[PDB]
Short mmCIF file of C-alpha atoms (C1' of nucleotides) in Angstrom, two decimals:
data_model
loop_
_atom_site.label_atom_id
_atom_site.label_comp_id
_atom_site.label_asym_id
_atom_site.label_seq_id
_atom_site.Cartn_x
_atom_site.Cartn_y
_atom_site.Cartn_z
CA UNK A 225 100.48 30.69 -16.47
CA UNK A 226 98.16 32.68 -18.28
CA UNK A 227 94.61 31.61 -18.08
CA UNK A 228 93.03 30.63 -21.25
CA UNK A 229 89.90 28.69 -20.57
CA UNK A 230 88.78 27.82 -23.83
CA UNK A 231 91.05 25.69 -26.18
CA UNK A 232 91.80 22.25 -28.11
CA UNK A 233 92.44 18.72 -26.92
CA UNK A 234 94.19 16.63 -29.32
CA UNK A 235 93.93 12.91 -28.73
CA UNK A 236 96.33 10.94 -30.54
CA UNK A 237 95.67 7.46 -30.29
CA UNK A 238 97.77 4.34 -31.61
CA UNK A 239 98.10 0.80 -31.10
CA UNK A 240 101.30 1.60 -28.88
CA UNK A 241 100.46 4.41 -26.87
CA UNK A 242 98.05 7.60 -26.25
CA UNK A 243 99.14 11.02 -26.16
CA UNK A 244 96.93 14.13 -25.39
CA UNK A 245 98.02 17.44 -25.58
CA UNK A 246 95.85 20.52 -24.81
CA UNK A 247 96.00 23.70 -26.69
CA UNK A 248 94.88 27.34 -26.84
CA UNK A 249 92.33 28.55 -29.25
CA UNK A 250 95.41 29.39 -31.30
CA UNK A 251 97.12 25.82 -31.35
CA UNK A 252 99.92 26.48 -29.13
CA UNK A 253 99.97 23.48 -26.66
CA UNK A 254 99.44 24.36 -22.94
CA UNK A 255 100.56 21.05 -21.74
CA UNK A 256 100.73 17.21 -22.97
CA UNK A 257 100.54 14.05 -21.40
CA UNK A 258 100.94 10.32 -22.43
CA UNK A 259 101.08 7.07 -21.01
CA UNK A 260 104.72 7.28 -20.59
CA UNK A 261 104.33 10.65 -18.85
CA UNK A 262 102.49 8.97 -16.23
CA UNK A 263 104.67 6.31 -14.57
CA UNK A 264 103.71 3.53 -16.53
CA UNK A 265 106.10 1.37 -18.51
CA UNK A 266 106.16 0.36 -22.06
CA UNK A 267 103.75 -2.17 -22.84
CA UNK A 268 100.97 -1.60 -20.42
CA UNK A 269 101.41 1.82 -19.89
CA UNK A 270 101.85 2.85 -23.42
CA UNK A 271 98.72 1.43 -24.99
CA UNK A 272 96.28 0.34 -22.36
CA UNK A 273 92.87 2.15 -22.46
CA UNK A 274 93.45 2.87 -18.53
CA UNK A 275 96.52 4.64 -19.40
CA UNK A 276 94.82 6.51 -21.95
CA UNK A 277 92.29 7.51 -19.29
CA UNK A 278 95.00 8.51 -16.87
CA UNK A 279 96.82 10.45 -19.67
CA UNK A 280 93.83 12.26 -20.54
CA UNK A 281 92.92 13.48 -16.89
CA UNK A 282 96.65 14.38 -16.33
CA UNK A 283 96.29 16.45 -19.65
CA UNK A 284 92.91 18.20 -18.07
CA UNK A 285 94.23 18.64 -14.69
CA UNK A 286 97.42 20.47 -15.76
CA UNK A 287 95.44 22.32 -18.08
CA UNK A 288 93.06 23.44 -15.43
CA UNK A 289 95.71 25.47 -13.77
CA UNK A 290 95.95 27.42 -17.10
CA UNK A 291 92.59 27.91 -16.35
CA UNK A 292 91.14 25.82 -18.95
CA UNK A 293 87.41 25.06 -19.04
CA UNK A 294 86.16 24.60 -22.39
CA UNK A 295 87.75 22.26 -25.00
CA UNK A 296 87.28 20.95 -28.58
CA UNK A 297 88.58 17.47 -28.75
CA UNK A 298 90.14 16.24 -31.95
CA UNK A 299 90.67 12.24 -32.41
CA UNK A 300 93.55 11.34 -34.60
CA UNK A 301 94.35 7.87 -35.51
CA UNK A 302 93.20 4.70 -34.35
CA UNK A 303 94.42 2.65 -31.54
CA UNK A 304 93.43 1.27 -28.05
CA UNK A 305 94.74 -1.36 -25.76
CA UNK A 306 95.41 -5.05 -25.34
CA UNK A 307 93.75 -4.80 -21.98
CA UNK A 308 90.49 -7.03 -20.90
CA UNK A 309 88.59 -3.81 -20.64
CA UNK A 310 86.67 -3.22 -23.72
CA UNK A 311 89.80 -0.92 -24.50
CA UNK A 312 88.83 1.01 -27.72
CA UNK A 313 91.71 2.97 -26.37
CA UNK A 314 90.98 6.21 -28.03
CA UNK A 315 87.44 6.33 -26.46
CA UNK A 316 88.53 6.07 -22.97
CA UNK A 317 90.52 9.32 -23.48
CA UNK A 318 87.42 10.87 -25.02
CA UNK A 319 85.52 10.04 -21.69
CA UNK A 320 88.14 10.88 -19.26
CA UNK A 321 88.07 14.44 -20.71
CA UNK A 322 84.25 14.62 -20.76
CA UNK A 323 84.34 13.71 -17.09
CA UNK A 324 87.78 15.54 -16.24
CA UNK A 325 85.73 18.54 -15.71
CA UNK A 326 86.37 20.27 -18.74
CA UNK A 327 83.27 20.78 -20.99
CA UNK A 328 83.79 19.15 -24.09
CA UNK A 329 82.18 21.16 -26.74
CA UNK A 330 82.97 18.81 -29.58
CA UNK A 331 84.56 15.41 -30.51
CA UNK A 332 86.17 15.74 -34.14
CA UNK A 333 87.60 12.83 -36.04
CA UNK A 334 90.33 14.21 -38.17
CA UNK A 335 92.69 11.33 -38.60
CA UNK A 336 95.39 12.40 -41.12
CA UNK A 337 95.92 9.99 -44.18
CA UNK A 338 98.56 9.65 -46.72
CA UNK A 339 97.85 10.40 -50.25
CA UNK A 340 99.86 7.19 -50.42
CA UNK A 341 103.40 7.58 -48.82
CA UNK A 342 104.87 4.11 -49.02
CA UNK A 343 103.86 0.47 -48.65
CA UNK A 344 102.54 -0.35 -45.27
CA UNK A 345 103.56 -3.83 -43.99
CA UNK A 346 102.43 -5.33 -41.09
CA UNK A 347 99.74 -7.24 -42.83
CA UNK A 348 98.31 -4.07 -44.17
CA UNK A 349 97.28 -3.30 -47.82
CA UNK B 241 68.00 -17.15 -1.06
CA UNK B 242 68.01 -19.79 1.80
CA UNK B 243 64.76 -19.22 2.70
CA UNK B 244 61.97 -16.69 3.88
CA UNK B 245 63.17 -14.96 7.11
CA UNK B 246 61.59 -16.90 9.87
CA UNK B 247 60.80 -14.93 13.06
CA UNK B 248 62.52 -16.32 16.22
CA UNK B 249 60.97 -16.28 19.54
CA UNK B 250 62.36 -13.48 21.82
CA UNK B 251 64.55 -14.35 24.48
CA UNK B 252 63.42 -15.86 27.64
CA UNK B 253 65.52 -13.74 29.87
CA UNK B 254 65.39 -10.49 28.11
CA UNK B 255 62.75 -10.70 25.40
CA UNK B 256 65.09 -9.67 22.48
CA UNK B 257 65.01 -11.66 19.51
CA UNK B 258 68.40 -10.29 18.46
CA UNK B 259 69.69 -12.26 21.41
CA UNK B 260 68.11 -15.64 20.31
CA UNK B 261 69.77 -15.03 17.09
CA UNK B 262 72.95 -14.54 18.67
CA UNK B 263 72.37 -17.83 20.58
CA UNK B 264 71.54 -19.71 17.57
CA UNK B 265 74.97 -18.53 16.21
CA UNK B 266 76.50 -19.92 19.18
CA UNK B 267 74.72 -23.19 19.28
CA UNK B 268 75.65 -26.62 17.51
CA UNK B 269 74.40 -29.91 17.14
CA UNK B 270 71.19 -28.33 18.06
CA UNK B 271 72.36 -28.19 21.85
CA UNK B 272 70.23 -25.08 22.56
CA UNK B 273 70.67 -25.34 26.25
CA UNK B 274 74.34 -25.35 26.35
CA UNK B 275 74.10 -22.38 23.90
CA UNK B 276 71.67 -20.37 25.84
CA UNK B 277 73.81 -21.00 29.24
CA UNK B 278 76.76 -19.71 27.44
CA UNK B 279 75.61 -16.46 26.56
CA UNK B 280 73.87 -15.96 29.69
CA UNK B 281 76.68 -16.74 31.80
CA UNK B 282 78.75 -14.33 29.66
CA UNK B 283 76.12 -11.80 30.32
CA UNK B 284 76.88 -12.24 33.93
CA UNK B 285 80.37 -11.92 33.29
CA UNK B 286 79.58 -8.50 31.47
CA UNK B 287 78.10 -7.62 34.89
CA UNK B 288 80.79 -8.21 37.24
CA UNK B 289 83.63 -7.21 34.91
CA UNK B 290 81.67 -4.06 33.72
CA UNK B 291 79.14 -2.00 35.31
CA UNK B 292 77.10 -1.95 32.40
CA UNK B 293 74.01 -3.94 31.70
CA UNK B 294 74.89 -6.65 29.46
CA UNK B 295 72.00 -6.34 27.12
CA UNK B 296 73.35 -2.87 26.32
CA UNK B 297 77.01 -3.97 25.87
CA UNK B 298 75.97 -6.69 23.51
CA UNK B 299 73.96 -4.43 21.32
CA UNK B 300 76.71 -1.86 21.21
CA UNK B 301 78.97 -4.79 20.31
CA UNK B 302 77.00 -5.80 17.18
CA UNK B 303 76.86 -2.21 15.93
CA UNK B 304 80.67 -1.96 15.67
CA UNK B 305 80.70 -5.32 14.00
CA UNK B 306 78.28 -4.47 11.20
CA UNK B 307 79.64 -3.82 8.01
CA UNK B 308 78.50 -0.93 6.15
CA UNK B 309 79.82 -1.89 2.94
CA UNK B 310 81.35 -4.98 1.28
CA UNK B 311 82.98 -5.79 -1.66
CA UNK B 312 81.50 -8.41 -4.13
CA UNK B 313 83.32 -9.92 -7.26
CA UNK B 314 82.06 -9.26 -10.31
CA UNK B 315 83.27 -10.12 -13.94
CA UNK B 316 83.94 -7.19 -16.00
CA UNK B 317 85.18 -7.52 -19.50
CA UNK B 318 88.77 -8.16 -18.25
CA UNK B 319 89.52 -9.65 -14.85
CA UNK B 320 86.62 -9.68 -12.13
CA UNK B 321 86.81 -6.73 -10.18
CA UNK B 322 85.49 -6.54 -6.85
CA UNK B 323 82.65 -4.11 -6.78
CA UNK B 324 82.06 -2.58 -3.61
CA UNK B 325 78.29 -2.51 -2.46
CA UNK B 326 76.07 -1.70 0.52
CA UNK B 327 75.04 -4.35 2.72
CA UNK B 328 71.51 -5.27 3.50
CA UNK B 329 70.36 -4.35 6.86
CA UNK B 330 69.44 -8.20 7.34
CA UNK B 331 72.64 -9.29 5.99
CA UNK B 332 74.68 -6.93 8.19
CA UNK B 333 73.29 -8.54 11.30
CA UNK B 334 74.03 -12.20 10.27
CA UNK B 335 77.48 -11.15 9.47
CA UNK B 336 78.14 -9.32 12.96
CA UNK B 337 76.57 -12.00 14.92
CA UNK B 338 78.51 -14.64 12.80
CA UNK B 339 81.74 -12.80 13.14
CA UNK B 340 81.39 -12.41 16.97
CA UNK B 341 81.08 -15.91 17.55
CA UNK B 342 83.84 -16.84 15.26
CA UNK B 343 86.30 -14.42 16.83
CA UNK B 344 84.98 -15.30 20.29
CA UNK B 345 86.01 -18.85 19.39
CA UNK B 346 89.22 -17.46 18.32
CA UNK B 347 90.20 -15.96 21.65
CA UNK B 348 92.82 -17.83 23.36
CA UNK B 349 91.31 -17.31 26.71
CA UNK B 350 89.30 -20.74 27.46
CA UNK B 351 87.28 -19.70 30.41
CA UNK B 352 84.28 -21.31 31.98
CA UNK B 353 83.81 -24.96 31.27
CA UNK B 354 82.62 -23.68 28.13
CA UNK B 355 83.39 -20.82 25.77
CA UNK B 356 81.54 -18.44 27.89
CA UNK B 357 84.14 -16.19 28.78
CA UNK B 358 85.38 -15.71 25.20
CA UNK B 359 82.06 -14.60 24.47
CA UNK B 360 81.96 -12.24 27.41
CA UNK B 361 85.35 -10.94 26.71
CA UNK B 362 84.83 -10.61 22.99
CA UNK B 363 81.67 -8.68 23.41
CA UNK B 364 83.18 -6.00 25.55
CA UNK B 365 86.17 -5.85 23.15
CA UNK B 366 83.52 -5.30 20.26
CA UNK B 367 81.69 -2.39 22.19
CA UNK B 368 83.61 0.60 20.80
CA UNK B 369 83.48 1.43 24.54
CA UNK B 370 86.25 -0.90 23.43
CA UNK B 371 85.87 -1.38 19.42
CA UNK B 372 88.66 -3.71 19.27
CA UNK B 373 89.06 -7.46 18.90
CA UNK B 374 88.92 -10.03 16.13
CA UNK B 375 85.27 -9.41 15.19
CA UNK B 376 85.71 -5.70 14.63
CA UNK B 377 88.84 -6.41 12.76
CA UNK B 378 87.00 -8.25 10.02
CA UNK B 379 84.30 -5.55 9.94
CA UNK B 380 87.07 -2.72 9.64
CA UNK B 381 88.81 -4.88 7.14
CA UNK B 382 85.93 -5.41 4.88
CA UNK B 383 84.95 -1.67 4.88
CA UNK B 384 88.59 -0.83 4.20
CA UNK B 385 88.48 -3.19 1.15
CA UNK B 386 85.53 -1.31 0.02
CA UNK B 387 86.02 2.13 -0.97
CA UNK B 388 89.43 0.88 -1.92
CA UNK B 389 88.01 -0.17 -4.87
CA UNK B 390 85.72 2.88 -4.99
"C1'" U C 287 98.84 -14.49 -30.62
"C1'" G C 288 94.74 -19.00 -27.38
"C1'" A C 289 99.56 -18.57 -25.77
"C1'" A C 290 103.85 -17.67 -28.26
"C1'" A C 291 107.93 -17.37 -31.55
"C1'" U C 292 110.06 -15.71 -36.15
"C1'" G C 293 110.66 -10.36 -36.96
"C1'" C C 294 111.96 -5.15 -36.23
"C1'" G C 295 114.68 -1.73 -32.70
"C1'" C C 296 120.59 1.60 -28.88
"C1'" A C 297 123.67 2.37 -36.91
"C1'" G C 298 117.63 4.70 -31.74
"C1'" A C 299 112.63 1.26 -33.53
"C1'" U C 300 107.64 1.99 -31.56
"C1'" A C 301 104.30 6.28 -29.77
"C1'" C C 302 104.39 12.42 -31.69
"C1'" C C 303 105.32 16.88 -34.80
"C1'" G C 304 106.73 18.89 -39.46
"C1'" G C 305 108.62 18.26 -45.05
"C1'" G C 306 108.97 15.35 -49.18
"C1'" A C 307 108.35 11.54 -52.83
"C1'" G C 308 105.40 7.33 -54.80
"C1'" G C 309 101.75 4.03 -56.02
"C1'" A C 310 96.69 2.20 -55.35
"C1'" A C 311 91.98 3.15 -53.92
"C1'" C C 312 87.98 6.59 -53.40
"C1'" G C 313 85.37 7.48 -46.66
"C1'" C C 314 80.49 10.17 -45.23
"C1'" C C 315 76.47 11.14 -48.97
"C1'" G C 316 74.91 5.09 -49.86
"C1'" A C 317 69.77 3.21 -49.96
"C1'" U C 318 65.89 -1.38 -48.59
"C1'" G C 319 68.84 3.47 -54.45
"C1'" G C 320 70.52 4.51 -59.72
"C1'" C C 321 72.92 2.79 -64.90
"C1'" G C 322 73.82 -0.66 -68.73
"C1'" A C 323 72.51 -5.97 -73.57
"C1'" A C 324 75.48 -8.87 -70.46
"C1'" G C 325 80.26 -8.81 -68.40
"C1'" G C 326 79.84 -4.94 -65.13
"C1'" C C 327 79.77 0.66 -63.50
"C1'" A C 328 80.43 4.60 -57.60
"C1'" G C 329 85.90 11.53 -55.07
"C1'" C C 330 85.40 15.86 -58.22
"C1'" C C 331 86.09 18.81 -63.12
"C1'" A C 332 85.60 19.44 -68.20
"C1'" C C 333 85.22 17.57 -73.19
"C1'" C C 334 83.64 13.39 -76.39
"C1'" U C 335 79.54 9.89 -76.42
"C1'" G C 336 75.56 5.45 -75.98
"C1'" G C 337 71.03 4.05 -74.11
"C1'" U C 338 66.35 5.80 -71.90
"C1'" C C 339 61.62 7.68 -69.66
"C1'" C C 340 57.79 11.62 -70.01
"C1'" A C 341 54.30 15.49 -72.17
"C1'" C C 342 52.45 17.29 -77.02
"C1'" C C 343 49.93 14.34 -80.48
"C1'" C C 344 52.78 17.33 -84.93
"C1'" G C 345 55.53 14.04 -89.11
"C1'" U C 346 56.19 8.90 -92.12
"C1'" G C 347 52.43 5.15 -93.06
"C1'" A C 348 53.30 -1.82 -91.24
"C1'" C C 349 58.47 0.66 -92.40
"C1'" G C 350 57.19 -5.17 -87.76
"C1'" C C 351 58.81 -9.87 -84.51
"C1'" U C 352 62.61 -13.56 -83.99
"C1'" G C 353 66.81 -14.62 -85.59
"C1'" A C 354 70.90 -20.66 -87.72
"C1'" G C 355 75.92 -19.66 -89.02
"C1'" G C 356 78.90 -14.33 -88.79
"C1'" C C 357 80.91 -10.00 -86.31
"C1'" G C 358 81.17 -7.81 -82.09
"C1'" C C 359 81.32 -7.08 -76.68
"C1'" G C 360 82.44 -10.32 -72.75
"C1'" A C 361 84.33 -10.62 -64.50
"C1'" A C 362 88.85 -13.06 -62.38
"C1'" A C 363 92.97 -15.63 -63.21
"C1'" G C 364 96.41 -16.26 -67.23
"C1'" C C 365 99.58 -14.81 -71.93
"C1'" G C 366 103.11 -11.42 -75.18
"C1'" U C 367 106.16 -6.40 -75.51
"C1'" G C 368 106.91 -2.20 -72.68
"C1'" G C 369 106.18 0.60 -68.21
"C1'" G C 370 104.99 0.93 -63.09
"C1'" G C 371 105.11 -1.03 -58.30
"C1'" A C 372 102.50 2.10 -52.00
"C1'" G C 373 99.52 -1.71 -49.87
"C1'" C C 374 98.10 -6.70 -50.72
"C1'" A C 375 99.85 -11.43 -51.82
"C1'" A C 376 99.60 -17.76 -55.24
"C1'" A C 377 104.74 -19.90 -55.26
"C1'" C C 378 108.40 -19.63 -51.98
"C1'" C C 379 111.47 -18.53 -46.98
"C1'" G C 380 110.58 -18.72 -41.76
"C1'" G C 381 107.77 -18.88 -36.79
"C1'" A C 382 104.00 -21.70 -34.14
"C1'" U C 383 100.25 -25.47 -33.56
"C1'" U C 384 100.01 -30.87 -34.20
"C1'" A C 385 100.77 -37.49 -33.61
"C1'" G C 386 102.07 -35.48 -38.46
"C1'" A C 387 100.83 -29.70 -40.65
"C1'" U C 388 103.47 -29.95 -47.33
"C1'" A C 389 97.06 -26.12 -43.58
"C1'" C C 390 94.37 -23.25 -40.97
"C1'" C C 391 97.29 -18.58 -36.72
"C1'" C C 392 101.93 -15.14 -36.94
"C1'" G C 393 106.59 -12.69 -39.67
"C1'" G C 394 108.56 -12.05 -44.40
"C1'" G C 395 107.98 -12.39 -49.83
"C1'" U C 396 108.05 -13.21 -56.32
"C1'" A C 397 104.76 -13.55 -60.09
"C1'" G C 398 100.29 -10.96 -60.01
"C1'" U C 399 97.14 -7.07 -58.42
"C1'" C C 400 97.97 -0.81 -61.63
"C1'" C C 401 99.11 1.43 -67.24
"C1'" A C 402 99.05 0.81 -72.39
"C1'" C C 403 98.98 -2.42 -76.90
"C1'" G C 404 97.85 -6.89 -78.32
"C1'" C C 405 95.84 -12.28 -76.95
"C1'" C C 406 93.17 -15.51 -74.25
"C1'" C C 407 86.76 -16.04 -73.67
"C1'" U C 408 85.85 -18.86 -69.35
"C1'" A C 409 82.38 -18.78 -64.74
"C1'" A C 410 77.41 -20.22 -59.37
"C1'" A C 411 78.91 -15.25 -66.96
"C1'" C C 412 72.75 -16.37 -61.83
"C1'" G C 413 66.65 -14.09 -61.59
"C1'" A C 414 70.29 -21.02 -62.00
"C1'" U C 415 63.78 -18.03 -65.46
"C1'" G C 416 65.59 -16.66 -74.08
"C1'" C C 417 63.16 -12.33 -76.95
"C1'" G C 418 58.51 -9.69 -78.64
"C1'" C C 419 53.22 -8.92 -78.17
"C1'" G C 420 48.22 -9.19 -76.14
"C1'" C C 421 45.05 -10.55 -72.15
"C1'" U C 422 44.05 -11.89 -66.72
"C1'" A C 423 41.87 -8.60 -58.76
"C1'" G C 424 44.15 -5.55 -55.70
"C1'" G C 425 47.06 -4.03 -51.72
"C1'" U C 426 51.81 -1.51 -49.85
"C1'" C C 427 57.01 0.73 -50.03
"C1'" U C 428 60.12 2.90 -53.38
"C1'" C C 429 62.99 5.68 -57.85
"C1'" U C 430 62.24 8.84 -61.87
"C1'" G C 431 58.57 12.20 -65.67
"C1'" G C 432 53.63 14.57 -66.14
"C1'" G C 433 48.94 15.95 -63.98
"C1'" U C 434 43.45 19.43 -62.37
"C1'" C C 435 49.65 17.44 -57.07
"C1'" U C 436 45.83 15.02 -49.29
"C1'" C C 437 45.87 11.65 -55.80
"C1'" C C 438 45.58 10.41 -60.68
"C1'" U C 439 48.57 8.85 -64.85
"C1'" G C 440 53.44 6.71 -67.48
"C1'" G C 441 58.42 4.31 -67.26
"C1'" G C 442 61.55 1.50 -63.37
"C1'" G C 443 62.87 -1.24 -58.42
"C1'" G C 444 60.72 -4.29 -54.06
"C1'" C C 445 57.25 -6.81 -50.96
"C1'" C C 446 52.37 -9.22 -50.36
"C1'" G C 447 48.38 -11.58 -52.58
"C1'" A C 448 42.76 -12.51 -56.93
"C1'" A C 449 42.13 -16.03 -60.50
"C1'" G C 450 45.16 -19.59 -62.27
"C1'" C C 451 49.86 -22.53 -62.45
"C1'" U C 452 53.08 -25.93 -59.67
"C1'" A C 453 55.76 -32.47 -57.48
"C1'" A C 454 56.30 -29.31 -53.76
"C1'" C C 455 58.99 -25.12 -52.55
"C1'" G C 456 57.08 -21.43 -54.71
"C1'" C C 457 55.21 -17.89 -59.03
"C1'" G C 458 51.24 -14.53 -59.19
"C1'" U C 459 50.52 -7.16 -64.37
"C1'" U C 460 58.68 -7.29 -62.88
"C1'" A C 461 54.21 -14.87 -64.35
"C1'" A C 462 56.80 -19.71 -63.13
"C1'" G C 463 49.04 -17.54 -65.14
"C1'" C C 464 46.19 -17.29 -70.13
"C1'" G C 465 47.88 -17.23 -75.54
"C1'" C C 466 50.60 -16.69 -80.36
"C1'" G C 467 55.77 -15.89 -83.25
"C1'" C C 468 60.84 -17.12 -83.69
"C1'" C C 469 65.75 -18.86 -81.46
"C1'" G C 470 68.66 -21.90 -78.21
"C1'" C C 471 68.62 -26.53 -75.20
"C1'" C C 472 67.01 -31.64 -72.64
"C1'" U C 473 66.11 -37.48 -73.20
"C1'" G C 474 68.54 -42.26 -66.37
"C1'" G C 475 73.56 -42.37 -63.45
"C1'" G C 476 79.01 -43.28 -63.92
"C1'" G C 477 82.69 -43.74 -67.75
"C1'" A C 478 83.15 -37.93 -69.39
"C1'" G C 479 83.17 -32.82 -70.59
"C1'" U C 480 87.21 -37.76 -71.34
"C1'" A C 481 89.11 -40.10 -76.21
"C1'" C C 482 89.41 -39.49 -81.26
"C1'" G C 483 89.04 -36.13 -85.35
"C1'" G C 484 88.52 -30.92 -86.57
"C1'" C C 485 88.50 -25.48 -85.77
"C1'" C C 486 90.70 -21.67 -82.79
"C1'" G C 487 95.17 -19.81 -79.31
"C1'" C C 488 102.02 -17.78 -78.30
"C1'" A C 489 100.66 -21.00 -74.26
"C1'" A C 490 97.81 -22.43 -70.66
"C1'" G C 491 93.92 -24.12 -72.86
"C1'" G C 492 88.88 -23.10 -75.57
"C1'" C C 493 84.65 -24.98 -78.83
"C1'" U C 494 82.58 -29.23 -80.67
"C1'" G C 495 82.09 -33.94 -78.60
"C1'" A C 496 81.76 -39.88 -78.35
"C1'" A C 497 82.24 -45.52 -77.66
"C1'" A C 498 83.57 -49.79 -74.73
"C1'" C C 499 82.16 -50.91 -70.17
"C1'" U C 500 79.20 -50.68 -65.80
"C1'" C C 501 75.04 -49.64 -62.37
"C1'" A C 502 69.50 -49.79 -60.59
"C1'" A C 503 69.91 -46.29 -59.50
"C1'" A C 504 71.31 -40.98 -60.01
"C1'" G C 505 67.73 -36.87 -58.77
"C1'" G C 506 64.01 -32.66 -57.24
"C1'" A C 507 60.69 -31.08 -53.31
"C1'" A C 508 58.50 -31.72 -49.03
"C1'" U C 509 57.42 -35.29 -44.03
"C1'" U C 510 58.48 -37.49 -39.61
"C1'" G C 511 62.78 -38.19 -36.45
"C1'" A C 512 67.76 -38.68 -34.93
"C1'" C C 513 71.91 -35.64 -35.02
"C1'" G C 514 74.73 -30.74 -34.79
"C1'" G C 515 80.76 -20.93 -27.67
"C1'" G C 516 71.43 -18.69 -31.42
"C1'" G C 517 67.34 -15.90 -28.69
"C1'" G C 518 63.12 -15.76 -25.16
"C1'" C C 519 60.32 -17.95 -20.91
"C1'" C C 520 60.95 -21.38 -16.50
"C1'" C C 521 62.78 -25.17 -12.61
"C1'" G C 522 65.88 -28.37 -9.43
"C1'" C C 523 70.58 -27.90 -2.63
"C1'" A C 524 72.20 -26.28 -10.17
"C1'" C C 525 75.00 -21.97 -8.48
"C1'" A C 526 74.87 -18.36 -5.05
"C1'" A C 527 73.92 -17.84 0.68
"C1'" G C 528 75.29 -20.85 4.92
"C1'" C C 529 76.40 -24.86 8.52
"C1'" G C 530 78.92 -29.32 8.97
"C1'" G C 531 82.63 -32.65 6.15
"C1'" U C 532 85.81 -35.57 2.23
"C1'" G C 533 91.02 -34.77 0.28
"C1'" G C 534 96.11 -34.94 5.88
"C1'" A C 535 96.28 -39.33 10.42
"C1'" G C 536 95.29 -44.19 12.35
"C1'" C C 537 91.78 -47.70 11.53
#
RNA sequence: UGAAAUGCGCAGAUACCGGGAGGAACGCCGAUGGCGAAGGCAGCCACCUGGUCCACCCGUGACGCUGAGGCGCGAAAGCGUGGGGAGCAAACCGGAUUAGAUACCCGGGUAGUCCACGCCCUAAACGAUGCGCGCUAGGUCUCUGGGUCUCCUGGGGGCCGAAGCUAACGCGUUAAGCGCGCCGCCUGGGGAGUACGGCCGCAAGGCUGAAACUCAAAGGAAUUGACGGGGGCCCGCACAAGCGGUGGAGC
């Protein structure tokens, strides 16, 4: 709509799925993608690093119309994929962006953590 | 690989090495004679049906038949992806010649006491003057496979 | 998860954003580092407090060393009362694997793990090496103080090594060397850290600690060898490349 060119990209990995949303210098999201956004179904789409890759690109390409060029990447959460590929899951997204055409100014890990909300199950703790 | 490339004596009729190679492809059981005859007779077939000189027709055929890119399997972290790759110039000829003879054998037409017509027809069909026939198909198919998995 | 299943989810889970509550731990810095007598101790802040090194050589003037029994401290688990409880998780309840699976793997889960007060007192509580002092080549890296600060000097942590020691492995100014002082401890293996007695403990248990009988060994280090999905280098029609074939039919 209204060219921005410089902005932020938030990569939110999880064991389930990857969702990336690009934003303005301000923080208001330009566009967003995920594995679901692309037509890929729940298990594979969601997590698969491949998916993360596709989602990353879709996010950038869509943002390209917005006139996006440079972006700061923020990584939140850890997650990946089951896939045979190395599938860090998060990394692929970080990669797809660097390649997508946008110049990535920086990668930053700001995974949130609770002070200590509630007990995790899932064999955690 | 199998061994160092041995140089081949050029063809008695037209002293072209490539021709001998083709002849070798045709021959089996070391019946070198029958093999040479089939190729020669085909060349005669190329002369009548087609105004062009056989030697030119054949070479053009091989060109159409040589695959530029082929896909080779490789094991990546997951699954074996088929990596596309160039083909050696040496490799391309062996594939082209081999594919011609195979496709030629493929043809229904059983002409001449032997195979000789199938070779004659196959080569013309190959030419890109006529770039059709079973030989070209394989060639086109491989290239298509490659760059599919670019 | 090897594959799975149990399990959770349409009373809407998972993934995503915001808000809140609660418990526990304290990423990077972080070390090959530091502190403490040991056990042990790592977010930041303040208060209270122990030990320790160096320089000056100023004060006392042998006031020293060790230390049976005592007293105190003493990881984890465990115990008592009360509190707390997010995650983790003996027992336990399920799923799977298996010949069986009272296990390893997966899903749950109570004590417990956290705090306070009291108790227990153990350990591969290890450097498997009691404390002090003196003496006996160096080299190298490191932490902390002084200096005339491309190195010297003091305290500490590592590595290599003189002399020497040691069964060997190894130790070697951080001694396992050369000496002196004092403490503790050993005396073949099993029976056995058991029995009995005593002392301690709420309890679990702890400390002390045998005998009969029995065996020619038990044992330490190192040597040759055999044995058991690390690395490097290199071969063979071993694979790949390629031509012909067996597996089908009849014989």
